[PDB]
Design a protein around this ligand. Structure first.
Ligand SMILES: CC(C)C[C@H](C(=O)O)[C@H](C)S
Ligand SMILES: CC(C)C[C@H](C(=O)O)[C@H](C)S
Ligand SMILES: [Zn+2]
Ligand SMILES: [Zn+2]
Ligand SMILES: [Zn+2]
Lengths: 396, 392
């Protein structure tokens, strides 16, 4: 099991391209074993990086020598994990939604939820992962066949544990509110919802068994010691090097070609075979953003005004509960340019209401968010999802 | 019994001094019957005001015709209220209680914990109600102590509800959690849950939005003094109102309000209070002195590092983000407020909290957020109490 005692997470501010390029020099030094949480992008995008203890002085002196400002977001990564492990140690009503679960625990949850709600909920298998694990989607439906549908996925990046944990909560919430809250009942009486809670099962299993900081898939790359592809750079729209890496060791390695990862191709084949997906929402952490296309280019989507207004309503709804502030905009404007990310592809297929979320927080814990924040994160995000779903329903 | 059907809460933005004055001009207008949640202060300080159903048209028209930009924070105040409307083990901490329910709770907690908890009456309110402080102590007499108060402004109901939760928490953790037991083995804790009982009974019986005391003001139709403008530190200087109808009316002399005088007497008679924490809502702020003047406190660096640690601790639980600083820097100039007085008496660890939220609900926070507010606030309180214990 990887440990991280004395590892720090630094947030580096890069004020111009020159400073971006200096941080890219650090990234190129594989011996430092750096783990970028938010990689070099453009000037003014903060660069968040986990630095192993023996690399800390070298990194700090480098940044200081070049006048590049940084702050220490996390002083001791292992303290957060030990805490996480510590608070980690029947029916869906007695399931603990306020802790983090393993892949087996989540998959057991899926079967319990189906067993308890056979007229609403079914489980679909859309593929098997690189390592052979089944990939499962929950389908919530009141009838029809291939009704217009909302697709939601969480955990495409395995280390973003609050997203799988929110997915589990959303699945339970849907079953609680169907037949009970009329406004939500109205959504499901017309639309199906598909929910993929563990979108990268191999990386997820790997975050529990081996390396809590694992992001990518677990595919092997011929003649490289580095494993895995960033599934959020592996989609066939805008694929390439302006916003992803051809280096197998990169956190944003895009693979050899689009849809090389079965976890991505399974969703592509599903969506195309279904043919009537009307909203597609892909959920990540962290940064508190709600985004619409495009990531790969600056040209607005033709539906930009409508999607921007809907984004504004959705973050206002989210903020209603706890005041959590999300910014919104195209991917390229709100966060950075990225090549081959999911909703560029889904929008290109005709799914107008294509959105991607980056949930809590804004870097103090990053993806090591305390379990105690699972439910608040899930509750607020559900209000944003309801906004998108109501719009999908009433304003197609 | 007030209802608020169709009342809105507006958040008014003021860019410069001239604009502040224009808003301050409709603060003067009794007929509008406005209720400022966050009054006119300096420029760049949002003004939050509940404007009544018959007055909404009138004030919307006033603002626009003067170019003051504003946003509508709360659309139907009633909706947030209709939403609202044995032992300490089975007491419901996730709901708001009445005065008598809280006073009954005080007796139940004392009865269940007779060697740790005692009730003390420090005075009576203007209307004659007893004013009670719970003392948590493991012995001695006038050991160094921490003072916490909630509810000095009656409408800030999450504070009294949190105070009830803290009382129970102290009884649960004492003798079980060593870090907290270390606090009470050296220091006493005084906790005043309902610091303004008349105003509290009034928020239940007549008017949910009541803030002040219920004292009658000689030669005025208006009732009550702002107990957090009535302390003898900067009394009557910029940062309070001399208008008896104002939310921030300072009264005729410092300590005119028996609810404030009773605390002042207690503190002076005790002489060993080492930390004093006065809790309010809303705004998500943790502040130290001064509110009445810009001069920093001699202890500013220490207090500011302590505040940073406390807000970091608080945020860990549910992500709630608090800003911190002197009152004057972090919110606005305010005169005659509690911690300027307590700090002037040598009480180094003088802090005032503003709890959830930052305006969606204001003081009409849903009962489902009581326990999360109280839990996260308790982490910040532990930070201050550890510091009082270990670094006098
Ligand atoms: C919309 C995308 C491009 C956001 C981002 C990423 O994949 O880099 C996540 C924060 S991991
Ligand atoms: C520190 C003081 C000025 C606090 C403030 C007030 O009394 O106005 C509360 C937010 S009600
Ligand atoms: Zn991600
Ligand atoms: Zn107050
Ligand atoms: Zn200490």
């Amino acid at each position: 099991k990887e440990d991280f005692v004395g590892h720090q997470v630094l947030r580096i501010s890069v004020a111009d391209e020159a400073q971006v390029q200096k941080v890219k020099e650090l990234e190129d030094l594989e011996h430092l074993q750096l783990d970028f949480w938010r990689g070099p992008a453009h000037p003014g995008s903060p660069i968040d990086v986990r630095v192993p203890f023996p690399s800390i002085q070298a990194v700090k002196i480098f940044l200081e020598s070049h006048g590049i400002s940084y702050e220490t977001m996390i002083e001791d990564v292992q303290s957060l994990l030990d805490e996480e492990q510590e608070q980690m140690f029947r029916s869906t009503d007695t399931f603990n939604y306020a802790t983090y679960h393993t892949l087996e625990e989540i998959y057991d949850f899926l079967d319990l939820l189906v067993a308890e709600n056979p007229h609403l909920v079914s489980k679909i298998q859309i593929g098997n992962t690189y390592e052979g694990r089944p990939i499962y989607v929950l389908k919530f439906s009141t009838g029809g066949s291939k009704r217009p549908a909302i697709w939601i996925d969480t955990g495409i990046h395995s280390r973003e544990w609050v997203t799988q944990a929110s997915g589990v909560w959303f699945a339970k919430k849907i079953t609680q509110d169907y037949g009970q809250d009329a406004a939500f009942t109205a959504i499901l009486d017309t639309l199906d919802i598909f929910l993929e809670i563990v979108t990268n099962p191999d990386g997820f299993a790997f975050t529990h068994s081996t390396n809590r900081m694992w992001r990518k898939t677990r595919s092997h790359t011929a003649g490289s010691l580095c494993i895995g592809v960033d599934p959020n750079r592996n989609w066939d729209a805008g694929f390439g090097l302006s916003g992803a890496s051809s280096n197998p060791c990169s956190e944003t390695y895009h693979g050899k070609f689009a849809n090389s990862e079965v976890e991505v191709k399974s969703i592509v084949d599903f969506v195309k075979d279904h043919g009537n997906i009307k909203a597609f929402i892909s959920i990540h952490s962290y940064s508190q953003l709600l985004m619409y296309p495009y990531g790969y280019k600056t040209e607005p989507v033709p539906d930009q005004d409508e999607l921007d207004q809907l984004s504004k309503a959705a973050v206002t709804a989210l903020a209603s509960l706890y005041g959590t502030k999300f910014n919104y905009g195209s991917i390229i404007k709100a966060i950075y340019q990225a090549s081959g990310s999911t909703i560029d592809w889904t929008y290109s297929q005709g799914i107008k209401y294509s959105f991607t979320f980056e949930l809590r927080d804004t870097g103090r814990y990053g993806f090591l968010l305390p379990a105690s924040q699972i439910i608040p994160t899930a509750k607020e995000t559900w209000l944003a999802l309801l906004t998108i779903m109501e719009h999908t329903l009433n304003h197609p």
